[PDB]
Amino acid sequence: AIVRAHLKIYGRVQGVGFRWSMQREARKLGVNGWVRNLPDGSVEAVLEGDEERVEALIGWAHQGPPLARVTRVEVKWEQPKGEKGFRIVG
Amino acid sequence: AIVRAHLKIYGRVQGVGFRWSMQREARKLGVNGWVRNLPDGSVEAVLEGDEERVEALIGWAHQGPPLARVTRVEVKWEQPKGEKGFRIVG
Ligand SMILES: [Cl-]
Ligand SMILES: [Cl-]
Ligand SMILES: [K+]
Ligand SMILES: [K+]
């Protein structure tokens, strides 16, 4: 089924390539959406596509790139909005 | 590469078949470890195996079975211990 996951990711997650690496992984998986930094130090993302591929990216987001140290992820499931491509937006 | 993720999972996560569904998904994916209910209403799990399989299960854990509502997952990455099979402990 097609799903849309809205994430907030916490930890040592800025300045370590999280957004670029997420985008690379989304494009490999065929997941559309976006990622951005928030001013509290967290990362916000929208992941939209086939449930298996979205879940794969959610799981990836608990590890992140080598220097990320994620402590927690929050997911809110949403109705698909027809995201096209995976973009870094902030 | 082999990884080990230690999770605490919060929300409406007990009394919804979460442990049974996680066990099913773990066995499907070939992830080793365990899951248990905690007295504060949260779920604790250890997931160990190939990183792609573990990541798929972590992603699944934010959806859960149909009635599950997962509000957050806390994660700690650990040194693998040699878990074999997945079981429910508590
Ligand atoms: Cl970044
Ligand atoms: Cl259960
Ligand atoms: K990492
Ligand atoms: K659910």
UniProtKB/Swiss-Prot annotation, chains A, B:
Coiled-coil region: none
Keyword Protein transport found: no
A Pfam family reported for this protein in Swiss-Prot or TrEMBL: Acylphosphatase
Domain of life: Archaea
E.C. code: 3.6.1.7
Domain Acylphosphatase-like, residue spans: 4-90
Noted pH dependence of activity: Optimum pH is 5.3 at 25 degrees Celsius.
Active site: 19, 37
GO terms for MF: acylphosphatase activity; hydrolase activity
Catalytic reaction annotation: an acyl phosphate + H2O = a carboxylate + phosphate + H(+)
Entries under PROSITE patterns matching the protein: ACYLPHOSPHATASE_1, ACYLPHOSPHATASE_2, ACYLPHOSPHATASE_3
Subunit architecture: Monomer.
Protein family according to the UniProt entry: Belongs to the acylphosphatase family.
Annotated protein name in UniProt: Acylphosphatase
Gene field: acyP
